[PDB]
Design a protein around this ligand. Structure first.
Ligand code: NA
Ligand code: NA
Lengths: 377, 377
C-alpha cells in the first residue's frame, strides 16, 4: 500500500481549501527580492517586517538577484531553498533526531545558540503556514511527535519507534515485563553541547527505583523529556507564526500522518544524483553488468528500501544537503563506492566509515537483485 | 522481465574483458586538458592528433578548466559531456530517427554539413571504442540497425518496428496480403534539408508496380534505403575509429541487444528533474493530493512507461539536452504542465503543443494510478 487513507486525505483537503479565505482586502502581490546566497536572513527580515499577516496571503512575487520565469515555480524554489536553510541544524533551531536519521526535531538548546530564537521560530511557523496556504511543500521531515504537537495530540511510547527502535524496544520490554532486574532510577542523561547532565525525571528521581508499580509513570516521563517539556516555548512560538496564516481549528481537521504529507510530501533518494556521484573499485566500472544490474535493482525498490540501502552503506539515511557529490565518510569527503568483493555465494557487505558497498560479482540480474534486497533487509 | 539473457551477457562480458589487453608498451596516462564550453572541438583535436592508438589505452587523466576529484569519475563526466555533443544533431553527424523518438541514426547528409565528416566519424568511433575499452557508458541511444551494422548483421523488416510502428505495420501488411490494391511503385520520397526527391529503389523503379511476385524485393530495397545504403562511408569511418581500440572480432561476440547495453546502458527519464520543472494550473499545486499521487504513480512505473507518459504529454519521448527546464512546445519554451480538468470519470488527456496533461481530480490514489496507466497505454 502506498497512500493509505487517500480517499479521506483528499476529502479533508477539499474541505480545508474551501474553508481557507483569500481576502480581497489586501495588495495584489507580496514581493520579495532576495539573493540565493543570503536567503535565510533576508527572508526573515522581509517576513518579520509585516505587521498585517493577511498581506502575506497575496500572490507571491519572489525574485532572485531574473524576470522570465513562472512565479509559482519561483515561489516553489524559494520554499525549497529556504527550507534547506531553516532546517539546517547549523542555525541551532532544528537538529536531526539521531545520527542515522534525516528527520528533524526542535533543538532544546535553540535559545543558547540564538538569543532571538523565538522570533526565528515564529518566522519559521509563518513560512510553514505560508507554504500550506499557497499549496507548496517544505523540503525536510520532522519527527512524528512534532506533527502531533502541532495538533495538540499526546505523545506516546509508540511515537518512539519511528525515531529510535532500540530505545523503543527497551521501553516496550519494560512495559511488558517486571523491570526490577534492570536496576533503573527516575533520572536520565541529557547531553548539551558535548556535556552530559543527569536530570531527574521527578523530584529526587535519581534515588527512586523503577518497579512494576511505577514503570508506566517512568515511561511517560522519559517520553515527556525526550519530545515535549524542553521545547514548548519553541513550539508555541512556531504555532503563533503558523496560525497567523492558518486557523488552528482548520489544520486540526488533519491527523498527524495527513499533516506530514500535506506539509512535507514523501521522502526519497534521487537515484540519478546517487548514480552520477558513485565510484567503482576493484574491477567495476559504469558499463559492468553487475553495476548496471545494481542501479536498475535500486530504481525498482520502493523509496523506503532505497533509504534503507543508503543507511546500510553509509551509516545514515540522510543525504547531504548539496546531494551526493558532498558525501562524507569517517575521514572527510568520501563518495559512495561499490567495490568488487567476495564470492557470488556471499551477501553484499558494507564499510560505513568509507560509504562503501562490497558487492560480489553475481552471475545474473535476478541473483543480484535478490541478494541485495536481502542484505538491505 | 528486466535484463533478459543476463547470464549470457555477463559470461560474454567476462570473456571480452580477459581478451582485452592493456599494453605495458605505453605512457602511464593519456592526458586531456579541456574547457567544458568547448569540449567537442577540443577533444576532436586531441584524440585525432594521436598516431599510435595504443597510447589512448593508458589511464585517462582528464582535467577541465580543478584537480581534487576521482579521475575515473572525471573521465565519466568527459564521456557524458562529450556524448551530449557528438550526438547533438546540431553538428550534422547524427540525427534523431523520428520526431517522437530519442534514438539516433547517422545523418546521410553529414558530408554536406561538414566536408571533413569522415574524420569526425572516425573520431566518434575512437571515442566509442575508448568508452568500451575503459568500461564507460555513452549518453545516447542509437537505433537498432546501427548496432546491427557495427556487427555486420543484415537489417530486416523487424528492425523497422522499434523505429517507426506505422511504417512497419504497412510493410508487414504488404508482406502478408496481395499488395496490388495499394498501387505502389519501386520509388520512395527522400527529404534532404526540406527538399523532397523521388528516388528509384531499382532502375526505372518509378514505373515498376509492386505485386505479389516482387513485394519481398520491394521491402528489402526500402529497408536498404532507410538504414544502410546512404551511410556506409560514415559507418565505415566510425568502424575504423572504433576498431583502433577494439578488434572487431572481440566486439562480435556480443549480439545487438547486448552491444547496446554494453555501450549505452538503459534508457529512462529523471523524475526529480521532471518534477522540479513542472507547473500546475487551474487549482493544482505541489501539495495537492492529486499531484502527490501523480508523481508517486510516475515513480512506480517502469522506465518504458515513464517514457510513454512523456511522449503522451509532449508528443515526444525525448528530453531536452539540458533537462526539463528547457522543455519546448509548439510556440517556444513551455514547461511540462498539469492542469485540473474534467470529471473524475474521465481519463486524462493531453495537449501536446502545450506539454500539458489534463488531469481529472480523482478521488483516491489507486483510481489516479489506474486511470493514468490506462491513458499512457
Ligand atoms: Na558514512
Ligand atoms: Na511538445
Amino acid at each position: 500500500l502506498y497512500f493509505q487513507g487517500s480517499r479521506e486525505f483528499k476529502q479533508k483537503y477539499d474541505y480545508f481549501r474551501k474553508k481557507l479565505k483569500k481576502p480581497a482586502d489586501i495588495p495584489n502581490r507580496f514581493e520579495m527580492k532576495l539573493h540565493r546566497n543570503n536567503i535565510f536572513e533576508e527572508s526573515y527580515r522581509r517576513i518579520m517586517s509585516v505587521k498585517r499577516p493577511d498581506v502575506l496571503k497575496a500572490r507571491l512575487w519572489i525574485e532572485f538577484e531574473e524576470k522570465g520565469l513562472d512565479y509559482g515555480g519561483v515561489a516553489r524554489e524559494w520554499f525549497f531553498l529556504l527550507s534547506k536553510e531553516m532546517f539546517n541544524p547549523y542555525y541551532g533551531l532544528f537538529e536531526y533526531s539521531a545520527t542515522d536519521n534525516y528527520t528533524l526535531q526542535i533543538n532544546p538548546n535553540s535559545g543558547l545558540c540564538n538569543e532571538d530564537h523565538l522570533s526565528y521560530f515564529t518566522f519559521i511557523g509563518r513560512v510553514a503556514g505560508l507554504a500550506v496556504f499557497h499549496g507548496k511543500l517544505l523540503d525536510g521531515f520532522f519527527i512524528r511527535p512534532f506533527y502531533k504537537m502541532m495538533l495538540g495530540k499526546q505523545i506516546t511510547l509508540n511515537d518512539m519507534e519511528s525515531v529510535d527502535s532500540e530505545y523503543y524496544n527497551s521501553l516496550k520490554w519494560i512495559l511488558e515485563n517486571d523491570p526490577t532486574e534492570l536496576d533503573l532510577m527516575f533520572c536520565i542523561d541529557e547531553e548539551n553541547f558535548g556535556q552530559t547532565y543527569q536530570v531527574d525525571l521527578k523530584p529526587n528521581g535519581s534515588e527512586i527505583m523503577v518497579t512494576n508499580e511505577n514503570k508506566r509513570e517512568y515511561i511517560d516521563l522519559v517520553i515527556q523529556w525526550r519530545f515535549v517539556n524542553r521545547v514548548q516555548k519553541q513550539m508555541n512560538a512556531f504555532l503563533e507564526g503558523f496560525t497567523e496564516l492558518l486557523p488552528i481549528d482548520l489544520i486540526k481537521i488533519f491527523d498527524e500522518n495527513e499533516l506530514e504529507l500535506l506539509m512535507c510530501g514523501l521522502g526519497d533518494v534521487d537515484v540519478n544524483d546517487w548514480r552520477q556521484h558513485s565510484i567503482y573499485k576493484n574491477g567495476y566500472c559504469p558499463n559492468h553488468p553487475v553495476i548496471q544490474w545494481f542501479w536498475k535493482a535500486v530504481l525498482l525498490m520502493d523509496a523506503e528500501k532505497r533509504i534503507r540501502l543508503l543507511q546500510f552503506v553509509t551509516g545514515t539515511s540522510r543525504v547531504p544537503m548539496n546531494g551526493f557529490a558532498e558525501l562524507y565518510g569517517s575521514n572527510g569527503p568520501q563518495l559512495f563506492t561499490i567495490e568488487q568483493w567476495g564470492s557470488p555465494e556471499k551477501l553484499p557487505r558494507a564499510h560505513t566509515c568509507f560509504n562503501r558497498l562490497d558487492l560480489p560479482p553475481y552471475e545474473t540480474f535476478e541473483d543480484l537483485r535478490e541478494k541485495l534486497l536481502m542484505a538491505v533487509e
